[PDB]
Design a protein around this nucleic acid. Sequence first.
DNA 1: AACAGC
DNA 2: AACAGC
Lengths: 175, 178
Amino acid sequence: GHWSQGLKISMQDPKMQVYKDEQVVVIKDKYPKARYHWLVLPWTSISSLKAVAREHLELLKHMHTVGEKVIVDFAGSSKLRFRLGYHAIPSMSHVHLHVISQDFDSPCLKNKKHWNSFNTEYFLESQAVIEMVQEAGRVTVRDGMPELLKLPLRCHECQQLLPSIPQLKEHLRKH
Amino acid sequence: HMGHWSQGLKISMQDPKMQVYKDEQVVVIKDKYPKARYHWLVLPWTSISSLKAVAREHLELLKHMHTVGEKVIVDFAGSSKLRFRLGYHAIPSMSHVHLHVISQDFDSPCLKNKKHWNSFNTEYFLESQAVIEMVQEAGRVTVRDGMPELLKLPLRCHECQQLLPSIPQLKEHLRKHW
DNA sequence: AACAGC
DNA sequence: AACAGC
Ligand SMILES: Nc1ncnc2c1ncn2[C@@H]1O[C@H](COP(=O)(O)O)[C@@H](O)[C@H]1O
Ligand SMILES: Nc1ncnc2c1ncn2[C@@H]1O[C@H](COP(=O)(O)O)[C@@H](O)[C@H]1O
Ligand SMILES: [Zn+2]
Ligand SMILES: [Zn+2]
């Protein structure tokens, strides 16, 4: 479906370009799952994590550095915590780096898949991906990622199990 | 002060037809809505308002209630080989403190919602022995905070610790341990 | 009105 | 006193 190309379309639209250089583009996540949620995409598209090889190393490092720069330039005075990583089995085409604040306070965060895709090992940290390409030369993704998306809701700050999304969002207010 | 319905245990325990066991100290009745194949309530003739009211004077009575519970198990469920737990609900709904004696099959149609499950499978369920130890060491029973929150915890099998998303799936899962 | 978009 | 039946 044409919906899966949204990232390539949006990153080519100057009105959506939070940041741009000769290597990458940054856009706001159209349906953000937190107060701050950006996506970093390279101009030279990569199909999936399986296609990543050592030639992509510096680019991945650049995507990480740019993500941290966007935090400084557009959320510097914030005390929030941030994580940078990739979804093991994404839905939108063209690999993209998630840069998202750990409040997870947003109406677009609506279901269990949303939560677990940022708060389970389904969320592959950027620094860990960079490490695999630097040493092994490829990105290895363990099995069972679809099951992680169906796990009961667990708080990422205190590890408490919650029974529903609404009760989770109320719990997050304590942190 | 709650309505007349909360006195059902006092009315039922005085009915000889409901008495599974009786002595000068305690009485045993079958739970009217059992949450397992075997489910009894042990109540003293000298009623206790709540766990907060328990003092060292009730210690021997509490141990007698426990021992009687253990005897009812062997007398009426000895051939079942089922596991049992003895404890009190931290925040009961029926008046008059009563000791739960329940088999761990949890195979019953009266078990219908999460509150039922977590009332017997979280810290909401205070083991009889633990209650006895507190009264022994400290002379009173202390209920920890956050009990209403425990009743909302996702369903967890008490045998293999697996988390289940619904009651019907839990009942189906429990088959594997019978 | 219908529909491909390289 | 509980409790259908209105
Ligand atoms: N047109 C778009 N522009 C920006 N972000 C988008 C767009 N469409 C989807 N997204 C986001 O991209 C992410 C795709 O998820 P995933 O495929 O798991 O990486 C989600 O956070 C979506 O909200
Ligand atoms: N008339 C009754 N006779 C025997 N058990 C009852 C009766 N009414 C309620 N119960 C049980 O007493 C318990 C009351 O809940 P709790 O106050 O949490 O111990 C539940 O297990 C009920 O099924
Ligand atoms: Zn928490
Ligand atoms: Zn189990």
